[PDB]
């Protein structure tokens, strides 16, 4: 592993060169354990007290889990107050 390098410029070099590679099997092994960690984490952290998607801040206002519950909320609750306003005018407010 010892190589003495002769370069005229600065100094001599004592390069080691430990050529190595994670065994072919060990790459499958680290994939195996990481799929195990993914499995464990999916199960356990799905079984966790998820503090944002439980409260009346999210599930109360809208909160179906989509990305449009805000927009259908602010597009339907004004129609809800227009409906309530018409039903108010139906009894002469």
């Amino acid at each position: 592993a010892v190589m003495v390098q002769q370069i005229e410029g600065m100094r001599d070099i004592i390069t080691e060169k430990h050529v190595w590679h994670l065994s072919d099997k060990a790459i499958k092994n680290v994939y195996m354990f990481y799929i195990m960690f993914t499995c464990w984490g999916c199960l356990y952290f799905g079984s966790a007290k998820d503090p944002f998607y439980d409260s009346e801040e999210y599930r109360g206002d809208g909160g179906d889990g989509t990305g449009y519950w805000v927009y259908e909320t602010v597009c339907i609750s004004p129609f809800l107050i227009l409906l309530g306003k018409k039903e108010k005018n139906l009894e002469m407010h």
Binding site: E8, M10, T15, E16, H21
Partner: protein, 407 residues
């Protein structure tokens, strides 16, 4: 010693991540570790009244990790690796106080400027791989003794490759094109002013150019380019620190002018005096930044918390009467930059100008003129901080003070 291991072996990569122990490795390693330990001892109390504490020390330790990996690097792959990681740590340290938006503009400008240098380091190491096929610090030194003597390689490609390879050190050592990231780094902490510059990270470019000087003396025109960029930024770094209201920005431009001195020494071909000036500046202006932050943390009790109040060098006035050991430390630092032979640092600048005047008459007397300007603004900083009345509790000025003294 070049204790290299293997990193990827699939095809023409055969990549290594080994650790190259030259005397430059020793200089850079002690230059990182001593300054980092002292800045951490400082930062135990600098951050002691900060809600952001542990993520600062995570950024500090990961920066020290990255910079020690940068200086122990056997190939341009790993230099590139830890180079960009140092740039990321610069982004994180400057945008540490993330809630203030001027630090947000500062850290964005900083990381973008470091990526403009990263750009050049990339197409500079790829150009060296096209000219050599090396990706190692070992074989470049024994190929560039006879690579320019060949007919396939172009001299134009080698000089533009070396200039793009120098674009990186422009962004790290805050040289004249890519210098606008350095004085905005003040909005983060004062330890990152002592560590991002006057230390490790602006020594990354100095380390890179001095490590690649066996392939910078060979390409003929790049040495003049490095001399030119240094001699342009020493007049910029001097004239900028003449009229700064901020203590930290003024010491930043002082750091930038001394880094221009280092690049002017690297443009001399001076393998020895450049590194020695790097050592004495990186131990001098680091002391100057810690003294400045002690001034700042003393002024926090007066003015409350504000950088236009507690970092404004104008209304610091005089602190010799109040904080004496800070005065002595800051004075020994500013005499270490002003060039006092017996009890300060002068032999570095002596070797700079001695190697300068026998080189080219254009670059020499303007370097001595900037040295006089450097002594001028550093003594201006010392007088505005420590010598005179306080400028803030002064009974001519503060009306609340006249209301408070006369009960």
């Amino acid at each position: 010693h070049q204790n290299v291991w293997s990193w990827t072996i699939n095809n023409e990569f055969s990549f290594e991540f080994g650790y190259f122990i030259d005397p430059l490795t020793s200089i850079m390693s002690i230059l990182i570790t001593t300054v980092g330990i002292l800045v951490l001892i400082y930062s135990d109390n600098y951050m002691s009244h900060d809600q952001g504490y542990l993520r600062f020390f995570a950024y500090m330790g990961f920066f020290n990790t990255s910079m020690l990996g940068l200086v122990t690097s056997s190939n341009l792959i790993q230099v590139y690796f830890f180079w960009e990681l140092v740039g990321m740590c610069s982004y994180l340290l400057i945008g540490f106080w993330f809630t203030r938006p001027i630090a947000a503009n500062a850290c964005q400008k900083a990381f973008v400027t470091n990526r403009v240098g990263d750009f050049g380091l990339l197409l500079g190491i790829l150009g060296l791989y096209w000219i050599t096929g090396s990706f190692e610090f070992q074989d470049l030194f024994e190929i560039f003794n006879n690579l320019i003597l060949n007919n396939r390689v172009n001299l134009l490609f080698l000089t533009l490759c070396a200039f793009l390879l120098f674009v990186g050190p422009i962004a790290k050592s805050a040289q004249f094109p890519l210098h606008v990231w350095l004085p905005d780094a003040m909005e983060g902490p004062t330890p990152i002013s002592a560590l991002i510059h006057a230390a490790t990270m602006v020594a990354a470019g100095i380390f890179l150019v001095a490590r690649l000087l066996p392939l910078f003396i060979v390409i003929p025109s790049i040495m003049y380019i490095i001399s030119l960029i240094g001699i342009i930024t020493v007049l910029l770094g001097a004239t900028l620190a003449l009229a700064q209201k901020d203590i930290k920005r003024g010491l930043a431009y002082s750091t930038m002018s001394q880094l221009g001195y280092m690049m002017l020494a690297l443009g001399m071909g001076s393998y020895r005096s450049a590194l020695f000036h790097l050592i004495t500046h990186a131990y001098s202006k680091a002391l100057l930044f810690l003294g400045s932050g002690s001034i700042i943390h003393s002024m926090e009790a007066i003015v409350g918390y504000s950088p236009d109040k507690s970092q404004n060098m104008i209304l610091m006035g005089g602190l010799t009467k109040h904080v004496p050991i800070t005065k002595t430390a800051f004075l020994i630092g500013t005499l270490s930059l002003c060039g006092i032979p017996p009890l300060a640092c002068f032999w570095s600048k002596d070797e700079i100008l001695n190697d300068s005047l026998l080189f080219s008459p254009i670059f020499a007397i303007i370097a001595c003129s900037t040295a006089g300007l450097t002594a001028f603004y550093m003594f201006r900083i010392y007088l505005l901080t420590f010598e005179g009345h306080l400028n803030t509790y002064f009974l001519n000025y503060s009306g609340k003070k006249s209301g408070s003294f006369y009960s």
